[PDB]
């Protein structure tokens, strides 16, 4: 009862902004995937 | 070894069965429905390949170069004709048991050459 009445002041939400990273985070995520896929190709090249 | 096939009777085309000529001490193949008997050239009656070692290149069909859905590469040229494009695929089979070998077939029509790397 008291803390729900405090949330009437602070509020809470979720939106599109929370789901978005910065540009450099995206560049790091993408560079991880780009290498990971190339590593799988090297495993395939040895198997083949 | 390889494998051992069948012989058929000249008189009646039933299967010939192996039996010994016990007095000449020689293997015969003999019909069970008629008097026909044939001297064996081979001595071997039977072979059985538990490891299943056989050259799968005898089982690749050259017509498969026509398949739109297989990947093909100029990166592995054909020996017999020099043609650059080959189609490549795995065993497409059971009984490879483990391997992921690629087999290559030349994509040049009427070459049909097959090899493994
Ligand atoms: Zn017969
Ligand atoms: Zn060829």
UniProtKB/Swiss-Prot annotation, chain B:
The keyword Acetylation applies. This is DNA-directed RNA polymerase II subunit RPB9. GO terms for biological process: maintenance of transcriptional fidelity during transcription elongation by RNA polymerase II; transcription by RNA polymerase II; transcription initiation at RNA polymerase II promoter; transcription-coupled nucleotide-excision repair. It comes from the Eukaryota. Pfam families: Zn_ribbon_RPB9, Zn_ribbon_TFIIS. It comes from Sus scrofa. The gene is POLR2I. Signal peptide: none annotated. One of its GO terms (molecular function) is zinc ion binding.
